Amino acid sequence: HKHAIPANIADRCLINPEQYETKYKQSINDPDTFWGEQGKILDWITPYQKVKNTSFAPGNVSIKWYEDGTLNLAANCLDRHLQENGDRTAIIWEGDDTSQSKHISYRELHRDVCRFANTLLDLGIKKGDVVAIYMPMVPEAAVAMLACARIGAVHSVIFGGFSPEAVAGRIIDSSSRLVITADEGVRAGRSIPLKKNVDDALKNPNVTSVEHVIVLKRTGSDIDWQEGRDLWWRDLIEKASPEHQPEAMNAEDPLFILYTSGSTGKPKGVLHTTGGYLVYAATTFKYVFDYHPGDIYWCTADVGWVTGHSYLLYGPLACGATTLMFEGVPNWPTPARMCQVVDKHQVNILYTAPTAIRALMAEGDKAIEGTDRSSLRILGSVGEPINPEAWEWYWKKIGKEKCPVVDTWWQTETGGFMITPLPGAIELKAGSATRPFFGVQPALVDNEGHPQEGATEGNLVITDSWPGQARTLFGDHERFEQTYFSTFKNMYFSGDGARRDEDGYYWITGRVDDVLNVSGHRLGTAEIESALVAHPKIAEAAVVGIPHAIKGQAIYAYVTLNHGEEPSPELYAEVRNWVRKEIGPLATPDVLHWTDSLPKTRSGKIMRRILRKIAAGDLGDTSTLADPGVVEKLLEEKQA
Ligand SMILES: Nc1ncnc2c1ncn2[C@@H]1O[C@@H]2COP(=O)(O)O[C@H]2[C@H]1O
Numbered sequence: 340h341k342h343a344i345p346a347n348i349a350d351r352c353l354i355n356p357e358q359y360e361t362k363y364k365q366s367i368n369d370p371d372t373f374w375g376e377q378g379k380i381l382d383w384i385t386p387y388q389k390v391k392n393t394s395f396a397p398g399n400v401s402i403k404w405y406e407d408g409t410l411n412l413a414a415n416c417l418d419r420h421l422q423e424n425g426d427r428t429a430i431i432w433e434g435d436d437t438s439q440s441k442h443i444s445y446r447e448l449h450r451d452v453c454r455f456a457n458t459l460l461d462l463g464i465k466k467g468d469v470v471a472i473y474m475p476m477v478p479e480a481a482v483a484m485l486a487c488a489r490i491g492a493v494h495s496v497i498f499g500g501f502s503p504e505a506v507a508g509r510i511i512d513s514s515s516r517l518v519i520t521a522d523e524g525v526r527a528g529r530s531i532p533l534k535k536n537v538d539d540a541l542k543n544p545n546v547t548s549v550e551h552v553i554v555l556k557r558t559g560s561d562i563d564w565q566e567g568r569d570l571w572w573r574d575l576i577e578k579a580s581p582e583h584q585p586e587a588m589n590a591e592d593p594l595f596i597l598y599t600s601g602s603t604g605k606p607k608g609v610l611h612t613t614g615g616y617l618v619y620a621a622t623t624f625k626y627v628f629d630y631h632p633g634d635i636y637w638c639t640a641d642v643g644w645v646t647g648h649s650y651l652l653y654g655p656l657a658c659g660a661t662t663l664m665f666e667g668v669p670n671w672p673t674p675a676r677m678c679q680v681v682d683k684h685q686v687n688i689l690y691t692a693p694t695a696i697r698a699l700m701a702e703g704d705k706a707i708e709g710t711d712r713s714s715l716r717i718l719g720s721v722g723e724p725i726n727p728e729a730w731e732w733y734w735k736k737i738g739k740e741k742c743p744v745v746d747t748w749w750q751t752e753t754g755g756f757m758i759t760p761l762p763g764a765i766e767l768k769a770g771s772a773t774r775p776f777f778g779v780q781p782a783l784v785d786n787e788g789h790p791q792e793g794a795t796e797g798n799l800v801i802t803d804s805w806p807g808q809a810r811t812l813f814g815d816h817e818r819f820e821q822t823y824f825s826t827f828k829n830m831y832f833s834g835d836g837a838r839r840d841e842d843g844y845y846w847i848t849g850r851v852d853d854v855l856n857v858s859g860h861r862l863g864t865a866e867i868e869s870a871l872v873a874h875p876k877i878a879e880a881a882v883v884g885i886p887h888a889i890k891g892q893a894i895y896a897y898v899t900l901n902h903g904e905e906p907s908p909e910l911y912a913e914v915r916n917w918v919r920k921e922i923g924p925l926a927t928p929d930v931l932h933w934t935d936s937l938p939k940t941r942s943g944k945i946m947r948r949i950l951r952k953i954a955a956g957d958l959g960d961t962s963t964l965a966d967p968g969v970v971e972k973l974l975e976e977k978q979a
């Protein structure tokens with residue numbers, strides 16, 4: 340069942356089916372001409388000559404785009420829009436409480452970003468310095484990010500739900516010089532203690548690089564204050580000059596670092612540079628959401644994740660869009676909140692997550708009760724697999740069967756959309772990302788790296804570079820090469836599995852490595868295991884994801900206790916909270932399963948496949964296990 344392109348969309352679309360085919364073919368056969376022309380979506384201070392200069396060679400990965408060009412991201416997202424569109428709203432802010440909202444014009448946003456860029460410079464922050472941003476969804480988070488970009492500082496945004504330990508780890512790895520935070524965040528009526536978490540992070544003796552903490556007064560709560568180190572946002576920004584001249588950055592100057600979980604090890608700082616990244620974010624934003632001047636756009640993703648970088652802020656602001664930043668959650672105070680915001684601000688494009696869609700869908704018509712939704716024209720889904728039922732419920736109930744849904748597949752390491760419909764070019768299948776974006780060459784390979792042709796399934800790789808590609812892991816280019824470019828030589832390995840059907844449409848089925856996706860949050864199996872075994876009473880741990888009707892995956896942990904310890908309600912609570920402390924509430928196990936029967940190879944390594952099946956409630960081949968006998972026991976313990 341393919342959904343046709345509706346006439347209202349065909350009448351206005353930027354890219355129709357023929358235009359998609361022609362552009363795609365040029366983008367693959369001649370990326371230098373294609374991207375040389377498409378790069379002019381940005382203002383360049385000096386033009387590039389060389390466009391594509393890349394190699395996925397084993398142990399010798401090198402990625403450069405537009406390398407001789409110079410530009411400024413903040414000038415592209417702000418300054419260049421002033422003369423004609425200074426009075427256009429850049430950010431609509433909607434508070435957690437519906438009585439609270441703000442409209443911030445391109446001129447107002449520009450003025451505050453200039454003031455804060457001057458604030459950063461005056462504090463001694465320079466081009467290349469890393470600035471940690473630990474902020475709630477308020478416009479000042481955007482001001483901070485844009486001001487860093489404006490001066491060539493490298494921001495590292497840390498999701499507000501991370502624990503003090505997790506904050507400290509990111510600060511340590513990045514040598515962040517400055518932390519920007521708020522006293523508290525406000526979410527679903529509740530307060531989250533951000534500044535206190537920062538205090539606790541900075542007590543880590545290995546945190547040595549932070550000289551100041553800028554604090555936004557969001558709630559005015561009683562916080563501890565360290566004289567000298569801590570500074571109030573308002574105090575600083577009101578002192579600063581609103582005049583700031585943007586300087587030119589090289590296309591390959593680092594723009595930001597975003598700490599990202601892997602199949603093994605601890606989170607690594609995925610690094611994006613400036614030129615290719617912004618070209619790709621602007622281009623994908625424009626064509627996939629069919630952006631026309633005047634369109635009101637709402638991405639629901641947090642600023643702390645890559646969607647919040649590329650599609651809440653940089654893509655839409657580069658294009659001069661009005662972008663909506665919502666402080667709260669889609670179902671507070673009631674399940675109808677998301678569609679109430681749509682109505683309130685006459686949103687035309689809605690881009691949200693399958694977990695959110697499923698949480699609303701569980702409430703049924705209470706999600707749309709009393710709302711109109713007629714301003715919507717385009718819908719999109721981000722960040723995790725979406726099954727056909729949820730897709731159809733979204734398309735029907737939120738979009739009233741009138742709105743194409745763009746199910747966008749991409750990753751933190753890809754910078755922007757990779758496989759996605761375009762609303763006026765591609766007919767839709769519920770649950771399918773459909774076809775690759777311009778400049779993207781996907782392939783499916785078996786475990787031996789052999790490309791599979793026709794209708795088939797396998798490991799999803801990308802066989803050549805694209806302008807938005809992450810360039811490295813901060814301080815760890817060899818691990819970058821290992822993780823993404825060693826499994827299948829000369830290819831980018833996404834870590835995802837996919838199916839291609841007889842029409843050539845792609846269906847992404849989930850991670851094939853040990854990365855979990857819990858409510859849209861990317862977590863590592865090994866890092867959660869490491870968190871658990873750090874507990875004084877825990878000897879060993881094996882973590883698996885299991886299907887969950889709302890969250891997509893839930894976290895199931897098998898735990899082996901030290902000799903002398905017994906399970907108890909106290910210990911159950913303590914271990915769950917231990918993971919909440921080491922990483923954050925986002926990584927809290929849903930289930931703890933106490934056992935002494937972890938399956939292991941004869942070399943001693945944990946075997947997780949059977950554990951996954953058992954936890955799911957299901958078996959496989961046990962001939963690699965040093966003791967098959969564990970299986971039966973594990974089946975009994977889960978029965979109880
Ligand atoms: N539309 C989608 N369908 C299936 N999987 C997705 C989709 N979008 C993102 N993902 C995966 O979910 C992961 C979440 O973290 P990342 O964005 O880093 O990388 C992402 C992809 O591997």
Ligand SMILES: [Mg+2]
Binds near residue numbers: 872874875877878
């Ligand atoms: Mg221990």
